[PDB]
């Protein structure tokens, strides 16, 4: 009984961990997008006057 219940508990823990990893995948994605935005903002073609970087 203890071993079967421990199997159940281990599966529950796997579900929890999968939830957290799925949460962090979108963190990766939006971090990539933010880096792209910064690399684009970094160039001097963009003007602070006409609100290029504020967008």
């Amino acid at each position: 009984s203890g071993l079967n219940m421990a199997s159940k508990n281990s599966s529950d823990a796997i579900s929890l961990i999968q939830t957290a990893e799925g949460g962090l995948n979108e963190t990766h994605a939006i971090l990539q997008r933010m880096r792209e935005l910064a690399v684009q903002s970094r160039n001097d073609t963009n003007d602070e006057a006409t609100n290029d970087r504020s967008n």
């Binding site: 970094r42 160039n43 001097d44 073609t45 003007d47 006057a49 006409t50 290029d52």
Partner: protein
């Protein structure tokens, strides 16, 4: 001939201080102080600086 010359001098000044790219005066001396910096690389510091004199 001096009439002609004065009009051409007004034009050489006009081209200087009415030239722009994305609302950015180029041939006035704006960039001769610090310079335009282009990010030509993914990482930080991978830049090139440029300067344009008053014309």
């Amino acid at each position: 001939l001096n009439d002609e010359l004065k009009q051409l001098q007004e034009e050489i000044t006009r081209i200087s201080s009415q030239m722009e790219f994305n609302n950015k005066k180029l041939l006035d001396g704006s960039q001769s102080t610090n310079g335009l910096t282009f990010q030509i690389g993914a990482n930080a510091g991978q830049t090139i600086t440029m300067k344009i004199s008053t014309m």
